[PDB]
Amino acid sequence: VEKVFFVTSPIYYVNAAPHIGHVYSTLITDVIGRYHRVKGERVFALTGTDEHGQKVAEAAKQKQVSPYDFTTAVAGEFKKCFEQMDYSIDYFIRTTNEQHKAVVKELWTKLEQKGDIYLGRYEGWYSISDESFLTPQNITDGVDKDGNPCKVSLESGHVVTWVSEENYMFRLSAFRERLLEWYHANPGCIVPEFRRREVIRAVEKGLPDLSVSRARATLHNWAIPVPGNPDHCVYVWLDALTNYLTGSRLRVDESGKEVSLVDDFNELERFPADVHVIGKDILKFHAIYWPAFLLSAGLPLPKKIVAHGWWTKDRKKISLGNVFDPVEKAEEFGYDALKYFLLRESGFSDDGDYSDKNMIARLNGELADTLGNLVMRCTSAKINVNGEWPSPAAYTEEDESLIQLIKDLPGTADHYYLIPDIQKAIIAVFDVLRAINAYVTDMAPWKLVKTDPERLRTVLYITLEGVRVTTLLLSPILPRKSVVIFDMLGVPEVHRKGIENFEFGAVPPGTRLGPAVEVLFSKRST
Numbered sequence: 001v002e003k004v005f006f007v008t009s010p011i012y013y014v015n016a017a018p019h020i021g022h023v024y025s026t027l028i029t030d031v032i033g034r035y036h037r038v039k040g041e042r043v044f045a046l047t048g049t050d051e052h053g054q055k056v057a058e059a060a061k062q063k064q065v066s067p068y069d070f071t072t073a074v075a076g077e078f079k080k081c082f083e084q085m086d087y088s089i090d091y092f093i094r095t096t097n098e099q100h101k102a103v104v105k106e107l108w109t110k111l112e113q114k115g116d117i118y119l120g121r122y123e124g125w126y127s128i129s130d131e132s133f134l135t136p137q138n139i140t141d142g143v144d145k146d147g148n149p150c151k152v153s154l155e156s157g158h159v160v161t162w163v164s165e166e167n168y169m170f171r172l173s174a175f176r177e178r179l180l181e182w183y184h185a186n187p188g189c190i191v192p193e194f195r196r197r198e199v200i201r202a203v204e205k206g207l208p209d210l211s212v213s214r215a216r217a218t219l220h221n222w223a224i225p226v227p228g229n230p231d232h233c234v235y236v237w238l239d240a241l242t243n244y245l246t247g248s249r250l251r252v253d254e255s256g257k258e259v260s261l262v263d264d265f266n267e268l269e270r271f272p273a274d275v276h277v278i279g280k281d282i283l284k285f286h287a288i289y290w291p292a293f294l295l296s297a298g299l300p301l302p303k304k305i306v307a308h309g310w311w312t313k314d315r316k317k318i319s320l321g322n323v324f325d326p327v328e329k330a331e332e333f334g335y336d337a338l339k340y341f342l343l344r345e346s347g348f349s350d351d352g353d354y355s356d357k358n359m360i361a362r363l364n365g366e367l368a369d370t371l372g373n374l375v376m377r378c379t380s381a382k383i384n385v386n387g388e389w390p391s392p393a394a395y396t397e398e399d400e401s402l403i404q405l406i407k408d409l410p411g412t413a414d415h416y417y418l419i420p421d422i423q424k425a426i427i428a429v430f431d432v433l434r435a436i437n438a439y440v441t442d443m444a445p446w447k448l449v450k451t452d453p454e455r456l457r458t459v460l461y462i463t464l465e466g467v468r469v470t471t472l473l474l475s476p477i478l479p480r481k482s483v484v485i486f487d488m489l490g491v492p493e494v495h496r497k498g499i500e501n502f503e504f505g506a507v508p509p510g511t512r513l514g515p516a517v518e519v520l521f522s523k524r525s526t
């Protein structure tokens, strides 16, 4: 299937201001999207805001403003944040959008017609902060804003409350076997692997039916009405998850505004998602509820769900006196640099840790000393006297060993990007960058200028090509810096994307370097 590559971030609750968690998830989404665009594919990358529900409406009430005003303002803050972070997301969806609501109603009605929605009761615990139903085994004792003895979620630590309401119920229990079939037939559909195992374990134990409506009073009437029953509202999570289906169906203009909802998702060739990027905290909603809904509706399932960890700063919980502002740190250290760090410092299996110390260490060691150094050396007037890509002479075995690494890199990085495992992709590229540096050091091209100009041609060419290829594969990570690098190397635009240009030798000898003006990454004081 030649289709539009469709990658999503979660849609974020607007109870609070954008923070590192949201920036991180959307970064991952952005990177995946960028890699598929550099690969030459059609791409649609989606992010946005989750605007209905009890949680949001209570947040509005606390700020003493209407839910409508509150959500529009906070959505505005999210949009500004993502603009500032220099992402390349194709559309920003809001669940208050009228087209989204129409899709929610269609999906609901499809589920109901299928016989998978019935009128029942939920009597049990509920975390308003996670909009999550919990069993008694997932709660325990704790404290609230006052410090009174309450119940809290084992998962999140947020206060839970007992709910007893007549609710539309979705027959989730009936989907156990089909979900297990899906997990097992598609053993790469959840990443990383240990999270896939967690999901399978949970579904094996059995599934209860799921409340998909709430009484309108409970949600302060801030939600989508149930079709044919105005006394009930659609569960915020059914509403929310449906964003991916809505997004897959919106025609978007040049300015990024939604102009049309298509009837059939196939018309835009996006659904279902190739990658849903999420935090570990919402895995059950995406790997269990979502596919069950899609199975009921007869809709295709997503290819991959990738679930990441949470950040800490200085080994401590990120208000409490430990702020981590990504815009602030990007202004201090550089946007590409901070992005690189977030993506390199930890894998999707880990809870990453930020500190200025280790940020500087990676900036200086990897970006400046390994990458930047190499870029300056091969473009330097001292070494590259003609300011061009030279024509190589005959290759030694040592030359061939480096060339082989450069040739193998795209295939290796490609597999990692598709997992997806961006950390391993970065590490693979930097392994090759370190080898190129070692080669340059062994060959001492600065001496060759006077001693053996023929040999220098060969060394310089291989080095330039290694820098081009590594930089191409790093361009989704360092989108702005990659352009600077290509400009220094004089790589024509046509050669900055497309799988054809993953091949060693794509830029011909005689190509002129860009003019000199200057540092790529400036090292910071320890």
Ligand code: MET
Binding pocket: 009, 010, 011, 012, 013, 050, 240, 241, 242, 243, 282
């Ligand atoms: C369908 S993605 C919804 C994510 C949810 N709003 C959250 O912030 O946790």
